[PDB]
Design a binder for this molecule. Structure first.
Ligand code: CA
Ligand code: CA
Length: 685
């Protein structure tokens, strides 16, 4: 019912995610353990199955290990059936333990359990108010070789046991056959194989339908969130249409994707994906910068806040960034022969910061290991007494209880090279967080200002990380104190909101008829009005209404970016959630292709049309730059675009750069989009 409820599948900023590599977390059922070469009994080969399953997770929920930490969501390995064959790479045996080598997206990986096991995991988690997020990897199926059918499983794809087809002899065109990618461009990495992985062709209608069906299966079993694998290597348009189909169905859920960024890297396409796909993102800029600041000491606190500010400016839905300090693919945050205080401070900062915190399993046990196999060792122990465990336990519930943590702005209150003092603020609630990474020197803090009411505040950590109490006078003036070496402290004030305040609106994208969720404070107990721009949604369009959450139906309003506001039964208006993207209607994925479009160096072909999805004839909102290399070759340009289904589209192609805008010749192009299926249209310049 409320924003903090486990039933709120759509918004996650009040949550704390715990990422589990299923096979490496706990073996609760040795019966479903793979036999033979696929299994490593003595755990000497980190590429084989160890035996971790869903039963183990269940046990760790029941005996209180996971619940004691205050984690409220579990992000687990892809649950779908994987190949069961052992593949040798460079002499070493490899299995599908990681769950990314899919065989059947409508069945379970028997090593993890069966559908009854999975339903029991969902049920146990939900019973303990814990959400369940699954990894989902629709980019590919498994390692394959066209001219060598005997290798691996040949990337075979089954539909509930029924063979849809393999990489060799792909008469249907289920997969891409454009070779392997060199990661030189986005385009090259989208329509080619990642290493040997059989790249799915989502322009094939059977595949679009198949994956929509599969994900609807898993959501139908009560899954609360999806982590999309390799979103950088699938078309933007297809993914937009896909999550659009999810949002328009029975189970709107929180979605976020993996778009890798290196250290000190910002990427316009990454930003555009986060802002306009309808899917959110793992926060790699945050992660890398925190690693640099606390773990490697190649950056300072000042740099860190600069990244906080720049990400704040870049991303439109900053409360949806899934933050983290490491992951299966990174070196463990704990360096062998290093203090554990680094980990603890990084954790505190993450737990109190904007977005959706995600904690990699074993982090609280200071597990070490560099590289893809070594960072995925078996869970070392379930010690509840570690300092990191207690840090998570102390700070995670604040995301539920304090609106400043979950929805608040972020403000720099003090900065050294060694010291970061940040304030989160939401209405009358606030949280002040102080961190000193210097392990030898304490820093006197004087002249600190806050939004905390007068009075004394104790450290929420209770000095667990050498934190201290503070006294606050009038005007938010904090009386002088000394931040101890390696010190970390959290002070906070939660107040009841007496005026409507929106913290988040999910999903961020939808067609008329979709149910959106609006979380916040002071909405009142009686149904008011929900506004999309100036367009009003009255009581019938209100699915539900209470003080911290409103569920409403998207009204038939002009498509495009739109502010969402709220008005109480009294008639009191709220703040406005910026940039909610209203869709024209249900979406299909159209491949636009245009031939004989010649351009000089520096000029690109773009697409404009009469729908908002096509920019509404605005060349600044044009779709592009289009591709000209893999699916089709220059001077042919192509692009996969999410467009309204069953809609008569009018459109032109343009040439930009300079921008000397050049429009196409004479009359517009006209095409009627398929009602349900993906499609392709081909024209000449
Ligand atoms: Ca097992
Ligand atoms: Ca791909």
């Amino acid at each position: 019912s409320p924003d903090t409820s486990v039933d709120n599948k759509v918004n996650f900023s009040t949550d704390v995610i715990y990422q589990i590599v299923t096979d490496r977390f706990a073996d609760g059922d040795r019966t479903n353990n793979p036999a033979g070469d696929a299994f490593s009994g003595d755990r000497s080969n980190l590429k084989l199955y160890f035996g971790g399953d869903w039963q183990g997770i269940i046990d760790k929920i029941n005996d209180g290990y996971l619940t004691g930490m205050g984690v409220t969501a579990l992000w687990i390995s892809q649950p779908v059936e994987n190949i069961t064959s052992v593949i040798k790479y460079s002499g070493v045996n490899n299995t599908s333990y990681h769950g990314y080598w899919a065989r059947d997206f409508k069945q379970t990986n028997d090593a993890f359990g069966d559908f009854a096991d999975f339903q029991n995991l969902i049920d146990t988690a939900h019973a303990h108010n814990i959400k369940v997020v699954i990894d989902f990897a629709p980019n590919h199926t498994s390692p394959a070789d066209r001219d060598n059918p005997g290798f691996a499983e040949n990337g075979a794809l089954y539909d509930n046991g029924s063979l849809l087809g393999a990489y060799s002899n792909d008469t249907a065109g289920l997969f891409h056959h454009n070779g392997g990618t060199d990661f030189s461009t986005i385009e090259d990495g989208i329509y080619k194989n990642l290493i040997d992985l059989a790249d799915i062709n989502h322009n094939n209608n059977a595949m679009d339908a198949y994956f929509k069906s599969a994900i609807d299966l898993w959501l139908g079993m009560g899954v609360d969130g999806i982590r999309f694998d390799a979103v950088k290597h699938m078309p933007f348009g297809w993914q937009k249409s896909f999550v659009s189909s999810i949002y328009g169905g029975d189970h709107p859920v929180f979605t976020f994707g993996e778009w890798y960024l290196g250290a000190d890297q910002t990427d316009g396409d990454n930003i555009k994906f986060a802002n306009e796909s309808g899917m959110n993102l793992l926060d790699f800029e945050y992660a890398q910068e925190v690693r640099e600041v606390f773990r490697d000491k190649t950056e300072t606190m000042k740099d860190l806040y600069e990244v906080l500010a720049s990400t704040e400016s870049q991303y439109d839905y900053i409360n949806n960034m899934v933050t983290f300090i490491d992951n299966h693919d990174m070196d463990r945050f704990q360096v062998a022969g290093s203090g554990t205080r680094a980990t603890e401070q990084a954790l505190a900062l993450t737990l109190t910061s904007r977005g959706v915190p995600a904690i990699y399993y074993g982090t609280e046990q200071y597990m070490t290991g560099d590289g893809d196999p070594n960072n995925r060792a078996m869970m070392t122990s379930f010690n509840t007494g570690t300092t990191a465990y207690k840090v998570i336990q102390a700070l995670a519930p604040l995301r539920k209880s304090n609106p400043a943590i979950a929805y608040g702005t972020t403000t720099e209150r003090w900065v050294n090279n060694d010291v970061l003092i940040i304030e989160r603020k939401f209405g009358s609630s606030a949280a002040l967080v102080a961190i000193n990474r210097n392990s030898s020197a304490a820093y006197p803090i004087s002249g600190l200002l806050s939004s905390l009411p007068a009075g004394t505040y104790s450290d929420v950590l209770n000095g667990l990380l050498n934190g201290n109490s503070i006294t606050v006078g009038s005007g938010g003036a904090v009386t002088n104190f000394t931040l101890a070496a390696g010190g970390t402290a959290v002070w906070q004030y939660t107040a009841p909101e007496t005026s409507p305040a929106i913290g988040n609106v999910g999903p961020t994208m939808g067609q008329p008829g979709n149910i959106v969720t609006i979380d916040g404070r002071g909405f009142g107990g009686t149904a008011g009005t929900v506004y999309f721009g100036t367009t009003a949604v009255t009581g019938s369009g209100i699915v539900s209404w209470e003080d911290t959450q409103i569920k409403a139906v998207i009204p038939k309003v002009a498509a495009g970016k739109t502010g969402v506001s709220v008005k109480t039964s009294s008639g009191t208006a709220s703040n406005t959630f910026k940039s909610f993207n209203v869709l024209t209607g249900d979406q299909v994925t159209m491949r636009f292709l245009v031939n004989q479009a010649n351009t000089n160096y520096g000029t690109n072909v773009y697409l404009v049309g009469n729908a908002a999805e096509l920019g509404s004839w605005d060349p600044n909102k044009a779709i592009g730059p289009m591709y000209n290399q893999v699916i089709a070759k220059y001077p042919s340009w192509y692009y996969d675009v999410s467009v309204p289904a069953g809609t008569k589209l009018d459109f032109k192609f343009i040439k930009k750069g300079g921008g000397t805008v050049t429009w196409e010749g004479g009359g517009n192009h006209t095409y009627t989009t398929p009602a349900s299926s993906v499609g392709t249209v081909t024209v000449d310049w």
